Symmetry: D2
Subunit: 335 residues, 4 copies
């Protein structure tokens, strides 16, 4: 199988582990995190929004016993000193937050893994990849790859259809977003100075910033610069919705043409629904974006149109499943 | 003292009562609600989001004694049978849902009231009024008036300015709106058949249909048909935000230009701020709309622009402040 | 397979549908409810707390096709007109709320069904059953049965192990309960004039009355009238905890004694845990009651003790699992 | 004019400040907290559960201006280095959590503060005080004093009545408690390793241990060791409830006795209500504890009785109101 190591056992790594149990041909052989394995198991066994774990987890000496396999654990802050050489590590899923610079992620490579996928936006001379949107830009010469953001993966396939079948001029975004753990529980000083994230996370509508629309050009170059936008974090623990309002070059555009162009590009990454769903219905899904045709909208005043669309995504598992897809493809580029 | 009657003692109707305590000149003399007085008194005295009643409430024989004043109480399904002439009612606040038409609400007039303000949009040949946006259209000859909806009251001052100072071509709207009492507590059939208002209210991001933007032109006739949009209901009990994405006819606009223009329009209906606030900060405010300059964005690609602005409101108390303002002005046209 | 009909497709009925999908030898062939099929399918298809439906739901001509099997759907007010003779109905699961009486439920027999299980407490001369606590009192002569309440099934295994291994002198119960559909979304008047259920459910801690404790004697007759209690309704949508504070006649009781007595009585209905779990961790589980050992407490002052124990239960799906268990038993009494 | 210094401007700090504004005789001349003034001032003006600051708050050279008063701002880790001498600090409120021991708090006295009130339970040769419960014990000799905990203040006036009037044999306690800032926002490793405080605070019923009941002896020594208990922390952001279940010497006790007993011992710390209220109703109250006579229960099985009672409190402002009472009393013990 493809031998995967996870660096960081946060929400993302733990869900990537769960997800990989569902994907044949991938095995997590190693998990590196500073937390004690007792607590790590407990956060793996139990999950507030993603549910109980499917199977049995137990802490054994040197790691965990999970569904009858061995996962070796490490508590090692210098990733260059992890034994990726002798574990024959194919891909590292980098989920710590301390390694989003390519020059800094080359430690996994020096520790002898063959390829690293950063589970965040990343800086340096690397490629940023949204699976099924532009992974066909990977030629296998890459050793460090960005997995983009959770919001980019909800956006990109919607923007690519908009732009491809209608010209894209410009557009703006709002992701009504689930609150995350970098928001405070009660009103208190926030570690990065953010006055809005400083506020009780489950009691408020909280504006905040998002890099995803501004960065999209890294995934779809031909629309680089043409998008920007924000977020509003609201009290659901996971589950998100990206609204996009655009101006298109093609004139006289219908709701029905938009919806039809999205449906035509459905696949495993990009879903499509016409059902009247809410956020909790997408918790745990494995689509990267679930285009919602109940919300397509065309405002027309003379020759001039504003077009608005919305796509769902579990900012946890939607992004995890796209990571695992890209993770595997990186491996398969080794022949 | 202006003699005020409240028809229907729901959220709208009880907040009106509370707000009127803080306005001198106005006096609630009668309340009509089919609910027994004991329970009504209890929901007056206690309020989950709006607080304890600043004062003292008690059920006496013919109604309540509030702060040493007599409030008459009726339990009468038929408006035209209410003793409004007996009490010299100057204006009825109509909050039941059952008289949201010009000719229906006319029943209050036959019963004795001088004028009626409908706390809701209304069909018929009546004027719809957002105070400090278009109440100048009232010429004194109106017996029956609509106070518009709680979303319209937060949209109008913003659209007015954008249309006046720059040329509003078209726009689209999303209100990240608190959840309301017509949403289901748990997943269950919905009495109006709405598949989204059927889901659990405080557990979901729920898309919904909004009336306000489609009908903005009853308040501002010169932008009729240029706005549309909807709501995202989210798990806060009150406090909302209206995002507006628009195309203007002035094509070299800046964020400064937009914000300054909004501050120049500042008053006791249209607040202005540059504090990074969140939804629970506007709970119980009496601005009908609080513009947020920190959220203004202008997007320029080539020489085409998109502009996004946002404004806060208590979908309860904001709307309530505006309704009492229009109440007073309607009783003012005795002159 | 045993042919099951569900009267009333509310939370209990849709969950009973789902659980029966996981029991071999059990089949739901008909559902009665006054709501349209389109809304009912949507509610079976999408659940806020129990997850996307496992499988495929579609509305077909005379009802539903679910996982390749047709399910007849009726909207028939009158129970005794239901084609249960023609559908060879072994057990009707009665979940509407209006037939919580032995003699009222006879209508299902009069319609030709073989047995009725009432999914609530019921009055009249019949039996109240908590599976794996007192279902052996079922001899086979019963046509109508009650499956008690969700809170009863959680308390009954625990109180039995307490009364058997030590003598129960008295006790008091508090269940920290998920809020339910019978509570209001916003502060508003309430169907049964309850000043507390009238308050916003997801925003308060709400005291409310219970019955499961005063009525324990129906399932355990030797401790009749020796328990009482109430509930505190809090903002989790599903998942509860029952705390029981008891006086025993056995006198040098220890935490280890209690816990061990509880562990030994463990079965498919009565779970045992020592993990430090929280409410969401039991959402969807199938134990009728999950004993939490980490919560056991003994207060000793001289020769006088006080013991406290606590058990989790998914107030929805734990009670669903129990009902289905008793349904299967009722059908296995084909002599 | 009692000159007050506040060390740590957390929830306890900012609310103590707010409480002090409405108390004639006290003024906060200084605040020390390592967070920049700009952020601290923002978090004082805007509070999620407690409302906007009534008044004006601005940042000025050297600190804050609040309602036309100067408040000096420092940000010093070393308490000994703080200029309490020069500012003639009569009392310091110790609200950082890191000085919760008498030889730790002394660092303020050496700095020239006359007296110190620690806003938490603290260890050492000091006294632990619940105003209007055991503050009679202060003689004027103390320089450091603990204010106990926000549950001890809740529990102590109910215990005392029970003990004096009926004679407390033993009892156990459960407090249904709002979730606090030390709980995680999302599932993650916890600062103190607590596996239950490691979980999403707003999406769970969470058991957690509390010392309050165990250490009740520090306030009412004549029932030391007689109580034990725990907490259930639920998704309300402030407002809590302490449920006590006791055994008494005096028997044949009625509900009407217990309730009149608590009615008579009611003061400005200890309230008493017979209304059907809920947690939100007690947010921002300034009783230390509010007795709920609607939740009194007397289980009488034959000869032996179990008694239960309950009392609400706002774990924020109720405690804070109590502190500011004790603090004021410590200052006037400098005649
Ligand atoms: Na696998
Ligand atoms: Na580790
Ligand atoms: Na007034
Ligand atoms: Na009435
Ligand atoms: Na089955
Ligand atoms: Na039906
Ligand atoms: Na003062
Ligand atoms: Na500071």
């Amino acid at each position: 199988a493809v031998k995967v190591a996870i660096n960081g056992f946060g929400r993302i790594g733990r869900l990537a582990f769960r997800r990989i149990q569902e994907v044949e041909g991938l095995e997590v052989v190693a998990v590196n995190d500073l937390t004690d394995d007792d607590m790590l198991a407990h956060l793996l066994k139990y999950d507030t929004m993603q549910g109980r774990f499917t199977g049995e987890v137990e802490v054994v000496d040197g790691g965990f016993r999970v569904n009858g396999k061995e996962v070796k654990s490490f508590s090692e802050p210098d990733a260059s000193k992890l034994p990726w050489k002798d574990l024959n590590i194919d891909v590292v899923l980098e989920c710590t937050g301390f390694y989003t610079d390519k020059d800094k992620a080359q430690a996994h490579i020096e520790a002898g893994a063959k390829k690293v996928l950063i589970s965040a936006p990343a800086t340096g001379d690397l490629k940023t990849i949204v699976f099924n949107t532009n992974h066909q830009e990977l030629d296998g010469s890459e050793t460090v790859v960005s997995g983009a953001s959770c919001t980019t993966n909800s956006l990109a396939p919607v923007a690519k259809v908009l732009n491809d079948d209608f010209g894209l001029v410009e557009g703006l975004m709002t992701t009504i977003h689930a609150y995350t753990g970098d928001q405070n529980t009660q009103d208190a000083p926030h570690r990065k100075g953010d006055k809005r994230r400083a506020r009780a996370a489950a009691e408020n509508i909280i504006p905040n910033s998002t890099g995803a629309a501004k960065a999209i050009g890294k995934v779809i170059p031909e629309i680089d610069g043409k998008l920007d936008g924000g977020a509003q974090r609201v009290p659901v623990a996971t589950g998100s919705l990206t609204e996009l309002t655009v101006v298109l070059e093609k004139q006289d555009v219908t709701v029905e043409q938009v919806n039809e162009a999205m449906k035509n590009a459905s696949n495993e990454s990009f879903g499509y629904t016409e059902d009247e769903i809410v956020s909790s219905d997408v918790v745990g899904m494995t689509y990267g974006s679930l285009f919602d045709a109940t919300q397509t909208r065309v405002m027309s005043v003379g020759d001039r149109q504003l077009v608005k669309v919305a796509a769902w995504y579990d900012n946890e598992m939607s992004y995890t499943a796209q990571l695992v897809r890209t993770l595997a493809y990186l491996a398969e580029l080794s022949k």
